[PDB]
Write a protein that binds this DNA or RNA. Structure first.
Ligand SMILES: [K+]
Ligand SMILES: [K+]
Ligand SMILES: [K+]
Ligand SMILES: [K+]
Ligand SMILES: [K+]
Ligand SMILES: [K+]
Ligand SMILES: [K+]
Ligand SMILES: [K+]
Ligand SMILES: [K+]
Ligand SMILES: [K+]
Ligand SMILES: [K+]
Ligand SMILES: [K+]
Ligand SMILES: [K+]
Ligand SMILES: [Mg+2]
Ligand SMILES: [Mg+2]
Ligand SMILES: [Mg+2]
Ligand SMILES: [Mg+2]
Ligand SMILES: [Mg+2]
Ligand SMILES: [Mg+2]
Ligand SMILES: [Mg+2]
Ligand SMILES: [Mg+2]
Ligand SMILES: [Mg+2]
Ligand SMILES: [Mg+2]
Ligand SMILES: [Mg+2]
Ligand SMILES: [Mg+2]
Ligand SMILES: [Mg+2]
Ligand SMILES: [Mg+2]
Ligand SMILES: [Mg+2]
Ligand SMILES: [Mg+2]
Ligand SMILES: [Mg+2]
Ligand SMILES: [Mg+2]
Ligand SMILES: [Mg+2]
Ligand SMILES: [Mg+2]
Ligand SMILES: [Mg+2]
Ligand SMILES: [Mg+2]
Ligand SMILES: [Mg+2]
Ligand SMILES: [Mg+2]
Ligand SMILES: [Mg+2]
Ligand SMILES: [Mg+2]
Ligand SMILES: [Mg+2]
Ligand SMILES: [Mg+2]
Ligand SMILES: [Mg+2]
Ligand SMILES: [Mg+2]
Ligand SMILES: [Mg+2]
Ligand SMILES: [Mg+2]
Ligand SMILES: [Mg+2]
Ligand SMILES: [Mg+2]
Ligand SMILES: [Mg+2]
Ligand SMILES: [Mg+2]
Ligand SMILES: [Mg+2]
Ligand SMILES: [Mg+2]
Ligand SMILES: [Mg+2]
Ligand SMILES: [Mg+2]
Ligand SMILES: [Mg+2]
Ligand SMILES: [Mg+2]
Ligand SMILES: [Mg+2]
Ligand SMILES: [Mg+2]
Lengths: 80, 191, 107, 95, 166, 140, 97, 15, 148
RNA sequence: GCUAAACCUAGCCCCAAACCCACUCCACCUUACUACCAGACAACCUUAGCCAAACCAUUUACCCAAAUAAAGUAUAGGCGAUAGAAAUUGAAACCUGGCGCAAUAGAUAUAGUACCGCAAGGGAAAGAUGAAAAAUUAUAACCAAGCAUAAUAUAGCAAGGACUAACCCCUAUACCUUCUGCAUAAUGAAUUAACUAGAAAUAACUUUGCAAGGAGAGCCAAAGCUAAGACCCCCGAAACCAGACGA
RNA sequence: CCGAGCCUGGUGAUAGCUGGUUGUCCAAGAUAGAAUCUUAGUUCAACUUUAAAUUUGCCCACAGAACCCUCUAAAUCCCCUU
RNA sequence: CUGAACUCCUCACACCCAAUUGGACCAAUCUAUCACCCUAUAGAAGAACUAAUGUUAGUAUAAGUAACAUGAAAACAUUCUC
RNA sequence: CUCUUACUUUUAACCAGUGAAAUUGACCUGCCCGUGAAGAGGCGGGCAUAACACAGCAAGACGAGAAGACCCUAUGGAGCUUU
């Protein structure tokens, strides 16, 4: 056994990458991942396109009936 | 490094057991030519260029240089508001929790070096509080050193210690070149 | 290598620049350390540079997560979905200002 | 040369240099001429005149002779009534 | 040493939905440390590769090589293992999906030569791996016909661009 | 203190990743791959002079072919377009012969017209004036 | 091959133990102690190395005259051989003269 | 032209 | 290290070897330049400028007799008895500017240095100290610690 | 997917301190480990040579009773290589620690065993679960070469430029060493892993300190002195001598 | 493997001879000759490298440098200016 | 007319000599102090291998090649041949 | 020997079982002429050319094996002889 920590730590990182390639994880929504603020991401959406959107209206343009129906199912199970 | 002694040592091809006989004839075998089985090229052979301890790293900076580093450490502590003068190291209680709550209220730091003039005149109150702590260490003025001043964030000196330091450190700035060691009798030394 | 690597043809994202120009950089995620000499240049970029960089680029959402770390990194995400991760380890403020701006210009 | 002695561990001095050459504190080495006592009956007075003259050595020679001697032979001495006392210091020398 | 082949019969798939199609059963089996060469055994595992269980057993029953009697024993016990443990209805509805050989832990002995010379001989060992799959043997791929050759050639003639220009 | 290389695995993988697509044992054995990876990088560095050379050879071959369709030779097209102050390079000319054939015939007719004016001037002794397409625009 | 597959146990170090918290103390015992003691006298270890420095040939020569009369026969014989080898290398072999 | 002959060298038995 | 030869193999000849021809340091004849150098007497010079400089700074008081000990105690000279030093020789440098009335004892003195000291009203005397006494006069304290 | 890979202990090294030193019975100098019979044998004595001197022939450092200094000085010497004092001076001293190794390392050592040799003598290799194995249908997988999954299609140091496209087109005389000069049909190399090779004085330079003084007695000094930093490899003969073992 | 045995040790014998000599990047850099039991090597010089100090260096105008003598040679040396 | 790493053009620029020499960086390891998904400033050193008919171990190539082996029948009792 | 032939055994080749050694820079390993460290499968100009095993042959790979024992060199050794 050789003494040291840098090479072992660096080798664990390559093993993780190899493991991910062999067994890639299922994709998930970007909101679930870290570093996400819905209110900040939706303002940039408009400024990005150089348009004077209305936040109240733009937030309802992304809300779909399927999401509302399921959002209620989650509350019923919990009684809220 | 001046008091470091490395004890590492390896064995040369002359100190490894055996290795006196020529392994096989010089010519004919069709193999490489070797004189011993304990040469560095072999498994289990001697170390060509390894440690040959015990090795010492002793050297001395000039007295005037070592005395000047103390001045700089004492000056840097004050300029950075890390030096605190006291009149006496007498605590009301020998509780180590008191000395810890006292350094946090005054915002001294995580580590404090307490310097007293002598080792025998140390109040027992502070001796019982620092003996149980790890970052609140107590030394006599004779044990002051640049390494411990840099390791600790805060430095605490008593008034007697201040006069003691000035006398010792300023004597180097005005003194003849030694005729013989200062441990021998002199006209005006010590004091 | 060319033979040891892949290739592509020159292209754009949604015919960008044809009707209007849309900045492709969509998100910037910095990971600096409160303590750590590696992140010294990243801390000074967050004090004076990042705020002025966000004013100029309102379509980019910038996240600054200050946590313990030995290697600070900046992650750039683009509209097309590409993700480029880069290290600002032991880089001066001037080096991090030209790098972040390069990320904003890319597609 | 012996760079490290086996008893003291220090550099030694070549005593064949001490019996032939003289070192001035400035760094100059003085010597005699090879053959100033050989076959004087076949040599001219002019040649004999420059044979018994004390001459200096060059840079390459003096650098070698300084390596073949220790620091004891490079110290400044104050012998009493030394004939070479005035030659141990250079005067009006530039560069 | 590695023994992953024995752990493949322990994976449990989730129950299938009503609309999903019937999933074929897979049966992994092997024999370790066979006193035989993997190079000689490779010719036997290559023979039955893709065959049916009953056709493979017939070819190995009239083969003169020693490995034949060993593989046939591994196939018979994988056949029973399938119906008894892996819920296979018909024992003949199986085919050889995978069949190969592996190197085993081998020993080293000395072979004496003339003039005081010597060689190092190895007592060779091998493994045999087989995978059975429920169902009939997949039909062999028909040989490429002239219509496919011409259809492919014309497709290459239609995919060629003007290179090194706009 | 005994020090040993702990990361020799990564030192050789940055060489073998460039040898993965090679053939034989020089795609997995460092000793063999290093000598062929080093030759590949040198070939790639010297190939930047050949690419530029072979391109111009390709353009000229395509211009020569497009000029023979109109009864011209490569020197008579390039040389006489310069005499008409038209500074079009081989790359553009070869692109026009493929994607703009009606423009390339106009350029060949211009070169053939300027070529015929040169012959007419070589028969005269200077008295006759210069041709319409032989005039040169001056820049001060 | 040649690289461990797991991470080693963490290397926990106490930076505030006795030996680290009191390192460097009494190094100026002379300057601040009226030169009664010398810092070299605080060094512990081989008696032939206290307050002294040299190369291997100098160390080996010094050890043989200071504790050579107490050394084991095999160790003393090897010391003498080491001094012989080093005498030849330093005084006869090298690039510079 | 001295008669030159190399004797065979056996290896450790335990190998 | 170069290519082959004695250069690369570390087997160069000794210093002074010229390849075989009689070396330079051997073909020169022997002369007694340093014959008996260890038995010659040396005297550290003390200039009148130095002495006057020590008196103007208070490092040597002219109110008491000046001997070899007072000069050493004032760091005016540095005697090396082990280097065949036998004392100090009073030299005449700085005689014109010298202005001091002293009673100095020096092992050697020039005729002009004497005149400069006897002109201002002083006294100069020459005395002999053997190597043993010379070490005691310069460093008395180390001698008083020997119980002799 | 096989073969394998991976591990942290065993103990070891250098110091310090302390002087060290047996046992049940029985057997053992004859052919040792052999209960029992007439004997008288007795110990001491300059090491040599390799090597250096570019040969060699006088000569060529080897702890010898206190660190330092005197001093590489006196002195010796084919007065060459090199060797080399003393008078005198006079210091410190609290075992239980480590900028030492961690199974090709560190003791050869799991052992002076196995094995080789008539004998003197030479002399190895290796181990790895877990709190529990009275949990063994157990501790996941991912990594060298080598193979397998998966033989092959004109043409060429095997690649590069590229290309819609693997190949086809175009370009291109392996590497190290050694040489006036090597694709050379000159040397070495099947490959993987691990191990495997620049050690220091003199002076000078650079950066601090103090300064006609410097230095923590010694020494140097006509700006010097103190301190630091930074320059000198590995394997290999035939041989020579001493002392043992062998008809 | 007896032109004189084997083992251990002196011994890390010696070898001007062969072989080998391990991270990245940039830069300057091809050399009259003398001596030597010396020509398979070494030392000095010459060339080459680094640091420092200082002032000239290269190119070159006239004028100028042998008689004896067979090639009445191509040229050189010296040299302000530029 | 073709035709270079010559030269121009757009941008950039320390980025093509052996031995030798000077300089700028640096992997990993240990120590001091930081740091705390693996780093920083320093101090140290058994500090870096495509080559020594290199050392040890593993596995290939040659190669499933060279080579090796059991007299006959039968009731396994026995008999037969040599 | 002219001048060889036939048969038997061994070997041989095929099946089965067991299973070495020297050698090996990497190889996708052709011919002619020319070139070149002066004798080319690898360079130049031409010719030839789907892929692949087995059995034979010994012209070449300056084929393998042994750091040429001939020759010269080394201020390298040794044996013998001698005014
Ligand atoms: K040397
Ligand atoms: K000799
Ligand atoms: K061992
Ligand atoms: K050749
Ligand atoms: K050869
Ligand atoms: K070759
Ligand atoms: K080679
Ligand atoms: K007998
Ligand atoms: K050679
Ligand atoms: K030579
Ligand atoms: K017949
Ligand atoms: K042949
Ligand atoms: K051959
Ligand atoms: Mg030995
Ligand atoms: Mg040897
Ligand atoms: Mg060892
Ligand atoms: Mg036999
Ligand atoms: Mg070489
Ligand atoms: Mg040479
Ligand atoms: Mg000799
Ligand atoms: Mg004495
Ligand atoms: Mg071991
Ligand atoms: Mg593999
Ligand atoms: Mg081709
Ligand atoms: Mg190399
Ligand atoms: Mg030649
Ligand atoms: Mg060539
Ligand atoms: Mg060839
Ligand atoms: Mg050769
Ligand atoms: Mg060195
Ligand atoms: Mg002899
Ligand atoms: Mg003898
Ligand atoms: Mg007999
Ligand atoms: Mg040698
Ligand atoms: Mg250059
Ligand atoms: Mg001679
Ligand atoms: Mg020569
Ligand atoms: Mg001029
Ligand atoms: Mg061109
Ligand atoms: Mg250019
Ligand atoms: Mg440029
Ligand atoms: Mg780093
Ligand atoms: Mg570091
Ligand atoms: Mg190393
Ligand atoms: Mg390796
Ligand atoms: Mg090797
Ligand atoms: Mg064959
Ligand atoms: Mg056979
Ligand atoms: Mg038989
Ligand atoms: Mg067979
Ligand atoms: Mg070979
Ligand atoms: Mg030819
Ligand atoms: Mg064949
Ligand atoms: Mg044959
Ligand atoms: Mg030879
Ligand atoms: Mg000889
Ligand atoms: Mg000899």
């Amino acid at each position: 056994v050789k003494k040291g920590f840098r090479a072992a730590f660096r080798f664990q990182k390559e093993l993780e990458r190899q493991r991910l390639l062999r067994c890639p994880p299922p994709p998930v929504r970007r909101s679930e991942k870290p570093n996400w603020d819905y209110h900040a991401e939706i303002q940039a959406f408009g400024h990005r396109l150089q348009e004077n959107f209305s936040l109240d209206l733009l937030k309802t343009a992304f809300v779909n009936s399927c999401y509302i129906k399921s959002e209620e199912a989650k509350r019923q199970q919990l009684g809220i | 490094n001046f008091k470091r002694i490395s004890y590492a040592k390896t064995k040369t091809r002359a100190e490894v057991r055996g290795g006196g006989r020529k392994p096989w004839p010089q010519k004919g075998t069709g193999r490489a030519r070797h004189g011993s089985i304990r040469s560095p090229l072999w498994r289990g052979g001697g170390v060509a260029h390894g440690p040959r301890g015990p090795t010492s790293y002793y050297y001395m900076l000039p007295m005037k240089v070592r005395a000047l580093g103390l001045k700089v450490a004492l000056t840097v502590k004050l300029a950075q508001d890390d030096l605190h003068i006291m009149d006496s190291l007498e605590l009301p209680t020998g509780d180590p929790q008191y000395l810890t709550e006292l350094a946090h209220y005054r915002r001294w730091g995580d580590s404090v070096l307490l310097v007293d003039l002598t080792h025998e005149e140390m109040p027992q109150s502070i001796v019982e509080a620092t003996s149980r702590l790890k970052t609140f260490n107590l030394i006599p003025a004779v044990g002051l050193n640049v390494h411990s001043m840099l390791k600790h964030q805060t430095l605490v000196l008593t008034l007697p210690t201040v006069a003691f330091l000035e006398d010792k450190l300023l004597w180097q700035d005005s003194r003849y070149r030694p005729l013989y060691p200062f441990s021998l009798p002199y006209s005006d030394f010590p004091r | 290598t060319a033979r040891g690597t892949p290739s592509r043809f020159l292209a754009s994202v949604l015919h960008n620049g044809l009707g209007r120009y849309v900045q492709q950089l969509q998100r910037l995620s910095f990971s600096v350390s409160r303590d750590g000499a590696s992140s010294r240049g990243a801390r000074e970029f967050v004090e004076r540079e990042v705020i002025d960089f966000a004013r100029r680029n309102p379509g980019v959402v910038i996240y600054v997560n200050s946590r313990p770390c030995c290697v600070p990194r900046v992650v750039a995400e683009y509209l097309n979905g590409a993700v480029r991760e880069e290290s600002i380890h032991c880089k001066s403020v001037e080096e991090i200002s030209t790098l972040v701006q390069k990320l904003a210009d890319q597609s | 040369l012996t760079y490290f002695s086996a008893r003291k561990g220090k550099r030694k001095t070549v005593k064949a240099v001490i019996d032939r050459f003289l070192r001035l504190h400035c760094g100059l080495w003085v010597r005699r001429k090879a053959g100033y006592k050989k076959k004087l009956w076949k040599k001219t007075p002019a040649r004999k005149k420059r044979l018994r003259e004390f001459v200096f050595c060059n840079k390459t020679q003096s650098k070698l002779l300084d390596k073949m001697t220790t620091s004891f032979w490079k110290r400044r001495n104050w012998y009493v009534d030394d004939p070479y006392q005035k030659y141990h210091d250079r005067t009006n020398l530039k560069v | 040493i590695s023994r992953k082949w024995e752990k493949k019969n322990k994976i449990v798939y989730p129950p299938q939905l009503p609309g999903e199609p019937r999933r074929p059963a897979e049966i992994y089996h092997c024999r370790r440390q066979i006193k035989y060469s993997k190079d000689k055994m490779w010719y036997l595992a290559k023979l039955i590769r893709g065959m049916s269980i009953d056709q493979a057993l017939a070819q190995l029953e009239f083969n003169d090589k020693k490995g034949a009697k060993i593989i046939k024993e591994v196939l018979l016990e994988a056949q029973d293992m399938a119906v008894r443990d892996h819920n296979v209805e018909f024992r003949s509805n199986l085919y050889i999906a995978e069949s190969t050989s592996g190197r085993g832990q081998c020993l080293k002995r000395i072979r004496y030569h003339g003039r005081g010379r010597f060689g190092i001989m190895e007592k060779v060992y091998c493994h045999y791996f087989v995978k059975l799959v429920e169902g009939p043997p997949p039909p062999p791929e028909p040989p490429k016909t002239a219509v496919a050759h011409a259809k492919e050639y014309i497709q290459q003639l239609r995919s060629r661009t003007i290179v090194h220009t706009l | 203190l005994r020090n040993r290389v702990t990361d020799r695995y990564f030192r050789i993988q940055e060489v073998l990743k460039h040898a993965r697509h090679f053939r034989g044992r020089k795609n997995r054995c460092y000793r063999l791959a290093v000598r062929t990876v080093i030759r590949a990088f040198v070939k790639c560095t010297k190939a930047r002079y050949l690419k530029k050379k072979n391109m111009r050879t390709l353009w000229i071959n395509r211009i020569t072919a497009a000029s023979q369709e109109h009864g011209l030779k490569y020197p008579a097209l390039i040389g006489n377009l310069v005499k008409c102050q038209v500074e079009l390079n081989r790359k553009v000319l070869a692109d026009l012969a493929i994607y703009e054939p009606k423009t390339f015939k106009s350029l060949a007719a211009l070169a053939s017209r300027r070529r015929h004016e040169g012959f007419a001037a070589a028969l005269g002794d200077g008295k006759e004036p210069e041709g319409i397409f032989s005039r040169v625009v001056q820049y001060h | 091959i040649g690289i461990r597959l797991t991470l080693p146990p963490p290397k926990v170090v106490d930076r505030w133990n006795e030996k680290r918290a009191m390192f460097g103390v009494y190094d100026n015992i002379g300057i601040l102690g009226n030169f009664e003691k010398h810092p070299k006298e605080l060094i512990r270890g081989p008696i032939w190395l206290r307050g002294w420095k040299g190369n291997e040939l100098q160390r080996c020569i010094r050890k043989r005259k200071m504790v050579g009369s107490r050394m084991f026969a095999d160790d003393l014989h090897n010391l003498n051989k080491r001094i012989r080898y080093l005498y030849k290398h330093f005084n006869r072999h090298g690039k510079f003269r | 032209t001295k008669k030159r002959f190399t004797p065979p060298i056996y290896q450790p038995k335990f190998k | 290290r170069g290519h082959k030869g004695e250069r690369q193999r570390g087997t160069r000849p000794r210093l002074g070897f010229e390849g075989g021809q009689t070396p330079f340091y051997i073909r020169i004849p022997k002369y007694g330049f340093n014959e008996g150098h260890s038995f010659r007497r040396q005297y550290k010079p003390l200039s009148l400028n130095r002495l006057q400089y020590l008196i103007d700074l208070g490092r040597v008081d002219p109110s008491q007799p000046i001997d070899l000990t007072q000069l050493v105690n004032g760091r005016g000279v540095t005697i090396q008895p082990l280097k065949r030093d036998y004392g100090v020789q009073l030299v005449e440098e700085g005689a014109d500017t010298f202005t001091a009335k002293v009673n100095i004892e020096v092992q050697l003195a020039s005729e002009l240095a004497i005149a400069a000291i006897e002109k201002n009203g002083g006294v100069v005397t020459t005395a002999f100290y053997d190597p043993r006494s010379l070490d005691i006069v310069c460093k008395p304290v180390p001698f008083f610690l020997r119980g002799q």
